[PDB]
Amino acid sequence: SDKFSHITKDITTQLAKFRKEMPELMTGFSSLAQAATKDGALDKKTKELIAMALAVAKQCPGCIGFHSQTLVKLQATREELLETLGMAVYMGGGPSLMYAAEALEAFEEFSK
Amino acid sequence: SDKFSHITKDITTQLAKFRKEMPELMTGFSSLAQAATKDGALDKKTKELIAMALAVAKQCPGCIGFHSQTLVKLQATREELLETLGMAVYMGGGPSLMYAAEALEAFEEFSK
Amino acid sequence: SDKFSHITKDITTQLAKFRKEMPELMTGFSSLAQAATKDGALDKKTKELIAMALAVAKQCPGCIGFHSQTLVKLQATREELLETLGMAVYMGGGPSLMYAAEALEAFEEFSK
Amino acid sequence: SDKFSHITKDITTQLAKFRKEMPELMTGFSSLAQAATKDGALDKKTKELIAMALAVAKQCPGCIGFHSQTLVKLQATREELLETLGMAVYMGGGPSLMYAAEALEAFEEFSK
Amino acid sequence: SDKFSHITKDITTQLAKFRKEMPELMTGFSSLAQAATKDGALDKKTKELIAMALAVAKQCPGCIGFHSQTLVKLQATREELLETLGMAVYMGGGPSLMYAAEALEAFEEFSK
Amino acid sequence: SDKFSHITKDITTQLAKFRKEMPELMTGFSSLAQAATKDGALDKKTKELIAMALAVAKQCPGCIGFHSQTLVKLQATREELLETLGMAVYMGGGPSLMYAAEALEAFEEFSK
């Protein structure tokens, strides 16, 4: 029942090393991430729903885990998540349905 | 100045043949598409913004063209499009920046 | 030795929730799936071999597991599977060779 | 009306240069291709139908062009092609529908 | 004979708009790009060869065009490019061979 | 602490079966791999750095494991690896950052 907690913590352990050893790269990346996700015409929660759809489409368990955790923090509802996953399935077929299952599992895990 | 009009019309010519020759497949696909894009907790425009992000991430000129055209129909603003493209670049890097350029070109074309 | 049984069962647990909570989406998707896989000019086994190649190309363990299980049910032979995996390697190189290994493991697991 | 003839000829012009300048790489690649596509439990036409599905899933106009041309040579029917494209749409959603349209265009072009 | 000059110029026209309208996003992205490509344990030419391999693997004509142009600027040789494309084919199969052809075309175009 | 040793060993077990049962395919694939990775204008270590970038971009844990192991054998430095991973992040965004973390974990595992 802690699959995605373990995935995200293991990635974070390595990213801490990147922040130390490639600080210019990680600073640049953070600047891109902050600029992309800031509140604007689309609010942060809406932008994170887009990130989740992309994470599913890219079949990336790590991104699914991190963006799930953020969606819980931003008080996204289960229904908002399900509707975003539906769009991923429309644009990805069978494989995206498989990762949509992973996204629901992650969201439920972090909603604990 | 009609790049995406030509791309979408050429695809539509083939899809008309699919509707005739594989009607069960195309009916099933349409049912999935309608269920995915219907108004709910996320409105149709928001769902189409997600579709556009996915189209950019999938590097699909056809989808970029169709979803651009729909965004114009749903009265999405330029700023809403730019913010969705920003999320694609965050989740895709250089390649997604290239297709974000295509998406802006398509949106401007259909806004004529 | 039950890797893919676990993977598929865990996905199925989530899909059961999708069937309850997004029935229109799942009905649409099922309609598309049934239309795509039905006997026609190509038989069901041949279509599942194509699905398995696509699963390997998409590097999707879930799809690999489900389609493996279906290939066993449809009495695909080991040699038919190997020849399909060969085509995936030709069209995908090193990475596809890695997922072809997973597909053989899954097929052997469900053939038990 | 010669879109894919032009795409395949332009690629072939470059591949002739690779055959001259990287003969060991091209010989290796040819050996893989021949081993993958040879008649066995699956006949060559069936293997090419698999290649066409993969080409659509990979959104590769070049691959779509070449494999279309080969399918015509191997006397694949329009209906066998359509059914293969249906499997790609099932495993790829909207983006694969867009490239399925390209595949039908290519098949019709080389059927002239 | 000016295919990639056109592709890159058309993308650059849109990116100029992004620089004006999303300056924080483009500044962040530029910071990431500069940090990634700067001389270090690997020199700039070596890093651009890696970028070209990734562009081919990502089947991105735009990236192929830009990175080709930069490789010429950095005085990469034809043989260094060919060897990089060989690695892409090994890791990508048929589809990568198709985009390796595009990369050679782009390199020859910007070497004029 | 043996995640990638386990992944690579499990794949190798299946590949041994492919070598026995599909020797023509595996011989062809080996010929391509040897031609691609041989010393030339780029040395073997440089070519493996390219393979590692591609493995990250393709989000392939198997490929990441094998190419990590080879990089250790070819005496690649940690800094050369980091810089290669930086290029992958530049060309892939968030998802590539997640697999770069996996690559660093693999490299550290095989450096033991």
Side-chain angles (χ1 to χ4, degrees):
Chain A
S1 63
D2 66 343
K3 180 182 178 180
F4 290 95
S5 176
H6 185 251
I7 289 169
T8 53
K9 287 174 81 178
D10 288 354
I11 289 162
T12 295
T13 298
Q14 311 301 335
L15 296 183
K17 300 170 195 176
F18 293 154
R19 300 217 75 100
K20 273 156 189 126
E21 302 179 56
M22 306 187 293
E24 197 180 324
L25 192 289
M26 296 304 287
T27 297
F29 185 78
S30 289
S31 295
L32 174 64
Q34 292 183 91
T37 56
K38 70 184 158 61
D39 273 298
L42 301 180
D43 63 22
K44 287 180 163 296
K45 178 188 76 191
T46 300
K47 290 186 187 191
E48 281 297 309
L49 291 168
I50 295 165
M52 176 58 77
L54 290 163
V56 166
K58 295 293 283 173
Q59 304 180 185
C60 182
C63 285
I64 286 166
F66 284 114
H67 295 302
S68 276
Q69 186 174 45
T70 302
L71 285 175
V72 169
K73 186 188 180 175
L74 293 174
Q75 306 179 11
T77 68
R78 189 185 181 86
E79 181 64 20
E80 291 167 329
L81 172 69
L82 292 176
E83 294 186 19
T84 307
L85 299 178
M87 287 303 298
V89 174
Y90 158 52
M91 299 286 288
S96 291
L97 186 62
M98 305 296 94
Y99 286 90
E102 293 212 357
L104 184 59
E105 180 186 335
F107 186 79
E108 286 191 349
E109 177 179 341
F110 291 115
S111 292
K112 278 186 108 184
Chain B
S1 63
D2 66 343
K3 180 182 178 180
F4 290 95
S5 176
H6 185 251
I7 289 169
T8 53
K9 287 174 81 178
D10 288 354
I11 289 162
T12 295
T13 298
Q14 311 301 335
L15 296 183
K17 300 170 195 176
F18 293 154
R19 300 217 75 100
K20 273 156 189 126
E21 302 179 56
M22 306 187 293
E24 197 180 324
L25 192 289
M26 296 304 287
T27 297
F29 185 78
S30 289
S31 295
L32 174 64
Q34 292 183 91
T37 56
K38 70 184 158 61
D39 273 298
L42 301 180
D43 63 22
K44 287 180 163 296
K45 178 188 76 191
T46 300
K47 290 186 187 191
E48 281 297 309
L49 291 168
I50 295 165
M52 176 58 77
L54 290 163
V56 166
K58 295 293 283 173
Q59 304 180 185
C60 182
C63 285
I64 286 166
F66 284 114
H67 295 302
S68 276
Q69 186 174 45
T70 302
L71 285 175
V72 169
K73 186 188 180 175
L74 293 174
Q75 306 179 11
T77 68
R78 189 185 181 86
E79 181 64 20
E80 291 167 329
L81 172 69
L82 292 176
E83 294 186 19
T84 307
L85 299 178
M87 287 303 298
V89 174
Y90 158 52
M91 299 286 288
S96 291
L97 186 62
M98 305 296 94
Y99 286 90
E102 293 212 357
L104 184 59
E105 180 186 335
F107 186 79
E108 286 191 349
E109 177 179 341
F110 291 115
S111 292
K112 278 186 108 184
Chain C
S1 63
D2 270 323
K3 182 181 177 180
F4 289 96
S5 176
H6 267 280
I7 288 169
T8 52
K9 285 173 81 177
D10 287 354
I11 290 161
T12 297
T13 298
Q14 310 302 332
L15 297 183
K17 301 171 195 176
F18 291 154
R19 300 217 76 97
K20 271 24 182 173
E21 303 178 53
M22 307 186 293
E24 198 179 325
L25 190 290
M26 295 304 288
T27 297
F29 182 77
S30 289
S31 295
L32 172 64
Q34 294 168 357
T37 56
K38 71 182 159 61
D39 176 80
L42 299 178
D43 65 23
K44 286 182 161 298
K45 180 187 75 190
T46 300
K47 289 185 188 192
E48 280 297 308
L49 290 169
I50 294 164
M52 176 59 77
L54 288 163
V56 166
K58 294 288 221 318
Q59 304 180 187
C60 183
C63 305
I64 288 166
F66 285 111
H67 294 303
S68 276
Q69 184 175 50
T70 303
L71 284 175
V72 170
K73 187 180 182 174
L74 293 173
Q75 309 174 15
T77 66
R78 190 185 181 85
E79 182 62 22
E80 292 166 328
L81 171 68
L82 292 175
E83 292 185 19
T84 307
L85 299 177
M87 287 303 299
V89 174
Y90 156 54
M91 299 286 287
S96 292
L97 185 62
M98 304 298 95
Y99 287 92
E102 293 212 356
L104 184 58
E105 181 185 334
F107 187 81
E108 287 192 352
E109 177 180 340
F110 292 114
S111 292
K112 269 186 326 184
Chain D
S1 63
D2 73 325
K3 180 182 178 179
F4 291 95
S5 175
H6 181 260
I7 289 168
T8 53
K9 286 173 82 178
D10 286 355
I11 290 162
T12 295
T13 297
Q14 309 302 332
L15 298 183
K17 301 171 195 175
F18 293 156
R19 300 217 76 99
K20 271 24 182 173
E21 303 178 54
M22 305 187 293
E24 199 181 326
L25 191 289
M26 296 304 286
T27 297
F29 184 76
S30 289
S31 295
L32 172 65
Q34 293 169 356
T37 56
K38 71 183 159 61
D39 272 298
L42 302 180
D43 64 19
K44 285 181 164 297
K45 179 187 76 191
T46 300
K47 290 186 188 190
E48 281 298 306
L49 289 169
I50 294 165
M52 177 58 77
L54 287 163
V56 166
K58 295 294 283 173
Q59 305 179 185
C60 187
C63 309
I64 287 167
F66 285 112
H67 296 302
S68 277
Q69 184 176 48
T70 303
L71 283 175
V72 170
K73 189 184 180 174
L74 293 173
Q75 305 177 7
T77 67
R78 190 184 180 86
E79 182 64 19
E80 290 166 330
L81 171 69
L82 292 175
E83 291 191 15
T84 306
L85 298 179
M87 289 305 297
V89 174
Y90 156 55
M91 300 285 283
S96 292
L97 186 62
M98 306 297 93
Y99 288 91
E102 292 211 359
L104 182 58
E105 180 186 333
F107 187 79
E108 287 191 349
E109 176 179 341
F110 291 113
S111 292
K112 271 187 107 185
Chain E
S1 63
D2 270 323
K3 182 181 177 180
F4 289 96
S5 176
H6 267 280
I7 288 169
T8 52
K9 285 173 81 177
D10 287 354
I11 290 161
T12 297
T13 298
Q14 310 302 332
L15 297 183
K17 301 171 195 176
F18 291 154
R19 300 217 76 97
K20 271 24 182 173
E21 303 178 53
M22 307 186 293
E24 198 179 325
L25 190 290
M26 295 304 288
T27 297
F29 182 77
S30 289
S31 295
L32 172 64
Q34 294 168 357
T37 56
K38 71 182 159 61
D39 176 80
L42 299 178
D43 65 23
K44 286 182 161 298
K45 180 187 75 190
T46 300
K47 289 185 188 192
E48 280 297 308
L49 290 169
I50 294 164
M52 176 59 77
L54 288 163
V56 166
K58 294 288 221 318
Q59 304 180 187
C60 183
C63 305
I64 288 166
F66 285 111
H67 294 303
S68 276
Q69 184 176 50
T70 303
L71 284 175
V72 170
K73 187 180 182 174
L74 293 173
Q75 309 174 15
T77 66
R78 190 185 181 85
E79 182 62 22
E80 292 166 328
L81 171 68
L82 292 175
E83 292 185 19
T84 307
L85 299 177
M87 287 303 299
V89 174
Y90 156 54
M91 299 286 287
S96 292
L97 185 62
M98 304 298 95
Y99 287 92
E102 293 212 356
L104 184 58
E105 181 185 334
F107 187 81
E108 287 192 352
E109 177 180 340
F110 292 114
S111 292
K112 269 186 326 184
Chain F
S1 63
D2 73 325
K3 180 182 178 179
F4 291 95
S5 175
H6 181 260
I7 289 168
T8 53
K9 286 173 82 178
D10 286 355
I11 290 162
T12 295
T13 297
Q14 309 302 332
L15 298 183
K17 301 171 195 175
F18 293 156
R19 300 217 76 99
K20 271 24 182 173
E21 303 178 54
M22 305 187 293
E24 199 181 326
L25 191 289
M26 296 304 286
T27 297
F29 184 76
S30 289
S31 295
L32 172 65
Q34 293 169 356
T37 56
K38 71 183 159 61
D39 272 298
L42 302 180
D43 64 19
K44 285 181 164 297
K45 179 187 76 191
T46 300
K47 290 186 188 190
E48 281 298 306
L49 289 169
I50 294 165
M52 177 58 77
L54 287 163
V56 166
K58 295 294 283 173
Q59 305 179 185
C60 187
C63 309
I64 287 167
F66 285 112
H67 296 302
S68 277
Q69 184 176 48
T70 303
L71 283 175
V72 170
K73 189 184 180 174
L74 293 173
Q75 305 177 7
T77 67
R78 190 184 180 86
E79 182 64 19
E80 290 166 330
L81 171 69
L82 292 175
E83 291 191 15
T84 306
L85 298 179
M87 289 305 297
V89 174
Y90 156 55
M91 300 285 283
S96 292
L97 186 62
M98 306 297 93
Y99 288 91
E102 292 211 359
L104 182 58
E105 180 186 333
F107 187 79
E108 287 191 349
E109 176 179 341
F110 291 113
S111 292
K112 271 187 107 185

